[PDB]
Amino acid sequence: ERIRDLTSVQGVRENSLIGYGLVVGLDGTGDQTTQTPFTTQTLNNMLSQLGITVPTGTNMQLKNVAAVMVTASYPPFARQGQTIDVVVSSMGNAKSLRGGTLLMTPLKGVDSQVYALAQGNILVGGVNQLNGGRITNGAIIERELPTQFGAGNTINLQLNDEDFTMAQQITDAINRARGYGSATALDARTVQVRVPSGNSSQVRFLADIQNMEVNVTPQDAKVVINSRTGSVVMNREVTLDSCAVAQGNLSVTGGSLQSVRSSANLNSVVRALNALGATPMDLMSILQSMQSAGCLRAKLEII
Amino acid sequence: ERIRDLTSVQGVRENSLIGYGLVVGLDGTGDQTTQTPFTTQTLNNMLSQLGITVPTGTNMQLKNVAAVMVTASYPPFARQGQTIDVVVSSMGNAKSLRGGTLLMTPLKGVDSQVYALAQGNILVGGVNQLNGGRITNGAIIERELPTQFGAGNTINLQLNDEDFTMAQQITDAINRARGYGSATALDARTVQVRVPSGNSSQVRFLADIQNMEVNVTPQDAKVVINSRTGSVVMNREVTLDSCAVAQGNLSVTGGSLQSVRSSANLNSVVRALNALGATPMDLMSILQSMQSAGCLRAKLEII
Amino acid sequence: ERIRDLTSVQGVRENSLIGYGLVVGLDGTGDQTTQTPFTTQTLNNMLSQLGITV
Amino acid sequence: TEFIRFSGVVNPRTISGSNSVPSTQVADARIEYVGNGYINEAQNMGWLQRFFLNLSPM
Amino acid sequence: VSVTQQGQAAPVQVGQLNLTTFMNDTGLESIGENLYIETQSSGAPNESTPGL
């Protein structure tokens, strides 16, 4: 059950759907409608569609209606009649969408075609975000996408992370499990697999391939630094080289220059860095300086 | 009783109905009708339909009437005379709908045709939402939709979640229960089933298929993060890789860098992450950083 | 496992992508839109694309 | 009788919320405003005067 | 209580301000914050429209 966790099947992908709607039933926490003319304009549009023509010159000050944007994911092999979850986000000067209801909303694709219709009740946590909510099974699929699955005798497994070693390992595992020339590698990210012609046979082949177990070879050493959240993460391949480190208000537990020993595994690296007595914000600067000097034998990525 | 919980039958789907109405009988908690002209306009329309013509130039300031939007679900194989539940949501500057009554409301479809008529008494909880309510059996079905069920010898079971393994498992279960070529797989989401021609025979076939038991194969590892509600959910397939984690105000229970051991099952992952002593909001950043680094062997989805 | 940590393969490189967007669902902590005309301009563009002409 | 005829090509996104578009946003705008009756014939040059206007030396 | 509005030559009525009349005004209990309450010596608060 590792191949399904390391790769994705070519043609089996997700799309993004967007749409505009109105959320009603709020407890006076909707749009002000004086700074958001589109709310009243679209409410008048809906009323006109339903058979009510409000005169153009009239002041409408609503409190229970909010103009919202609805986002959804079009799943692979989606069929009409199926339901998907949607996210509803306020667009202007609304206060809360706690007990609102989303009216009929057409969800358009990138090609500006309706692929789903959204309508349901919003669930809002209520420190919690008030202007955003989620509706489970809130949209029904209305259009279906053609696909080439089942045509041809080749399917590509696309690795989540590029690696020649992992691509070769997956290819060798498939060849060890299902014949000599069952899988070949095209690059560091794509493995081409030969499958029998048809739909059911390819589904069977993919079902056998997906749950296969592949031992993950060691990746590249990498230290991920998030300055916006104040976090540091080091994987198991990080090593250290011996060198001296000095930083403000940090001293030997003594002098301001502290030795850092040569470290081979991650436990040694953690011990050496904890001997410094550094706050993670200080550890960020220490790690960047050590990468500049050359002690840190890892790829420092700031995210 | 698992196939009915994993799939849906093609053509057996639900539609969405919308309509406009007026809710009367409120205790002075209705529309102000000065900022909502459509309430008074539609009340005048109703009175004119009933035989009362209020002169055009007249000031009407009501307090017990609220303009509302009514939403409903059209069930599969709906027949005229059947009753469905409706949701009633205020539209503008109304305060409460606690003891209101919904007048005759036609529920239109996407094609702007009346499929149901709604009228009844609203139930409002009364921290509780006041501008939204529900009426059980509040709408009577008036129109029926044609369908192709019972025609042809093919019916498609559509999986809620796409999976080649689950599609193959359902196909194999149906073939093991009801003959050799009873079911075939078309893609990761659809299983085609051969049924005898007719209506009663297909109902019998679907009744036997629906309650069948299928052992669910393990899905993809997935960590769901909800920042708006502040929640994290990890399924049973999540594993961990050994690496060091540092974050603000978190330290060894000591140094700011804490080791996280390699974890195979979910209990080990939970133990390793609880050893960090992290608040769930801190756990969100920790998990994102670990996914960036590569320790987290799961798909991180933010909902 | 050191050569992969000391070198990079020719042609196996990363590129940089940039784009403009709108972020909605904020709790009154968004743009003022009086000092940022492009926010309202692009919101109007999106609404016009979706079928609403303000 | 007066006739006002219009023809052209309209971009859908130029149409306003009240289903209106100004005539300056229409690509191949053909606008015609004509009439008949003796009022319209009173605004036509005589044939001799037109002949002179086209063929006179000055 | 009449309220005048725009585009409406006729003032609208909003309500009646009723006064309470007691039979021993000396007897009300002074709560403090400019409020009096009925006691046993000044029972039966009689509501009435002003003027009668």
Closest Cα partner for A134 from A262, A23, A265, A254?
A23
Smallest CA–CA distance, residue D29 to chain A, in Å, is: 28
Rounded to an integer, what distance in angstroms lies between the CA atom of residue A283 and that of residue A231? 10
DSSP state of A82: -
- Chain E nearest-CA residue for B62: E14
Buried b / exposed e along B266-296 (16+ C-beta atoms within 10 A): beebeebbeebebeeebbbbbbbbbbbbbbb
Q: Could A56 and D17 be called an inter-chain contact, meaning their C-beta atoms sit closer than 8 Å?
A: no
- Rounded (5°) CA angle A151-A155-A157: 155
**Is it the case that chain E and chain A have 3 or more CB pairs lying under 8 Å apart?**
no
Per DSSP bridges, beta strands B222-226 and D2-7 are unpaired
Smallest CA–CA distance, residue A28 to chain D, in Å, is: 27
Give the resolution to one decimal, in Å. 3.4
> Which alpha helices (H) appear in chain D, and where do they start and end?
38-41, 47-55
Instruction: State the chains in contact with E (3 or more Cβ–Cβ pairs under 8 Å).
Output: B
Rounded to an integer, what distance in angstroms lies between the CA atom of residue E41 and that of residue E23? 9
Smallest CA–CA distance, residue B248 to chain A, in Å, is: 6
Rounded to an integer, what distance in angstroms lies between the CA atom of residue B297 and that of residue B294? 7
- Which residues on chain B are in Cβ contact (under 8 Å) with A275? 255
- Which residues on chain A are in Cβ contact (under 8 Å) with B36? 60-62
Closest Cα partner for A33 from A7, A72, A59?
A59
Rounded to an integer, what distance in angstroms lies between the CA atom of residue A162 and that of residue A179? 25
Rounded to an integer, what distance in angstroms lies between the CA atom of residue A25 and that of residue B129? 8
Which tokens go with A137?
Answer: 């099974």
φ/ψ of residue C40, rounded to 5: -65, -35
Smallest CA–CA distance, residue B198 to chain A, in Å, is: 23
Which tokens go with B162?
Answer: 């796409």
- Coil vs helix vs strand at A286: helix
Answer for the pair B116, B84: CB distance below 8 angstroms, yes or no.
yes
> Which alpha helices (H) appear in chain A, and where do they start and end?
3-6, 37-50, 164-178, 200-210, 266-274, 280-293
* Experimental method, per PDB record: cryo-EM
Long-range contacts of A145-153 (CB under 8 A, 24+ apart): A145/A15, A145/A74, A145/A78, A147/A11, A147/A77, A147/B187, A148/A11, A149/A11, A149/A12, A149/A77, A149/A199, A149/A202, A149/B187, A150/A198, A150/A199, A150/A202, A150/B186, A150/B187, A152/A197, A153/A194, A153/A195, A153/A196, A153/A197
**Is it the case that chain D and chain E have 3 or more CB pairs lying under 8 Å apart?**
no
Q: Could D17 and C52 be called an inter-chain contact, meaning their C-beta atoms sit closer than 8 Å?
A: yes
